[PDB]
Write a protein that holds these residues in place. Structure first.
Motif, mmCIF file in Angstrom:
data_model
loop_
_atom_site.group_PDB
_atom_site.id
_atom_site.type_symbol
_atom_site.label_atom_id
_atom_site.label_comp_id
_atom_site.label_asym_id
_atom_site.label_seq_id
_atom_site.Cartn_x
_atom_site.Cartn_y
_atom_site.Cartn_z
ATOM 1 N N UNK A 67 0.824 -1.206 0.000
ATOM 2 C CA UNK A 67 0.000 0.000 0.000
ATOM 3 C C UNK A 67 0.859 1.257 0.000
ATOM 4 N N UNK A 68 1.791 1.353 0.950
ATOM 5 C CA UNK A 68 2.689 2.494 1.087
ATOM 6 C C UNK A 68 1.938 3.821 1.073
ATOM 7 N N UNK A 69 2.543 4.845 0.469
ATOM 8 C CA UNK A 69 1.926 6.164 0.467
ATOM 9 C C UNK A 69 0.647 6.223 -0.347
ATOM 10 N N UNK A 70 0.658 5.621 -1.535
ATOM 11 C CA UNK A 70 -0.483 5.719 -2.438
ATOM 12 C C UNK A 70 -1.675 4.959 -1.875
ATOM 13 N N UNK A 71 -2.751 5.692 -1.582
ATOM 14 C CA UNK A 71 -3.959 5.133 -0.985
ATOM 15 C C UNK A 71 -3.624 4.287 0.236
ATOM 16 N N UNK A 72 -4.273 3.131 0.365
ATOM 17 C CA UNK A 72 -4.038 2.207 1.468
ATOM 18 C C UNK A 72 -4.859 0.950 1.209
ATOM 19 N N UNK A 73 -4.477 -0.130 1.893
ATOM 20 C CA UNK A 73 -5.213 -1.389 1.873
ATOM 21 C C UNK A 73 -5.437 -1.898 0.455
ATOM 22 N N UNK A 74 -4.357 -2.207 -0.258
ATOM 23 C CA UNK A 74 -4.444 -2.712 -1.624
ATOM 24 C C UNK A 74 -4.946 -4.150 -1.541
ATOM 25 N N UNK A 75 -6.221 -4.350 -1.874
ATOM 26 C CA UNK A 75 -6.823 -5.675 -1.794
ATOM 27 C C UNK A 75 -6.456 -6.474 -3.037
ATOM 28 N N UNK A 76 -6.039 -7.722 -2.833
ATOM 29 C CA UNK A 76 -5.614 -8.606 -3.921
ATOM 30 C C UNK A 76 -6.371 -9.923 -3.821
ATOM 31 N N UNK A 77 -7.639 -9.940 -4.242
ATOM 32 C CA UNK A 77 -8.393 -11.201 -4.248
ATOM 33 C C UNK A 77 -7.924 -12.121 -5.362
ATOM 34 N N UNK A 78 -7.337 -13.264 -4.997
ATOM 35 C CA UNK A 78 -6.732 -14.148 -5.992
ATOM 36 C C UNK A 78 -7.764 -14.586 -7.023
#
Length: 45
Positions: A34-45
């Motif tokens: 996620x880092x700085x850009x937005x947050x909580x990068x969801x990765x549904x397989x």
DNA sequence: GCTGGCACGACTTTTGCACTCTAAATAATAGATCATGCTGTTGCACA
């Protein structure tokens, strides 16, 4: 409400806070780099 | 013999060709509303 909203519906204007939806299998993934850009990068397989 | 509309030689009129040459002062404010493109700012990944 009111009826400067019939115009809004027919003009297909997007709301200020749209609800995000998912795809066929939304597996839990929380965040992914996620880092700085937005947050909580969801990765549904 | 008397009279009343036609032509002619000076003069007069028209016509393209022709190139010219400061301060004031007037209104904003008081529609929003939305869409789109341009530019500067910042997060992300690479040698």
């Amino acid at each position: 409400g009111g009826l400067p909203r019939v115009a809004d519906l027919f003009e297909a204007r997007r709301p200020k806070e749209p609800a995000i939806l998912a795809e066929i299998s939304g597996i839990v993934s929380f965040g992914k780099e996620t880092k700085g850009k937005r947050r909580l990068v969801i990765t549904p397989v």
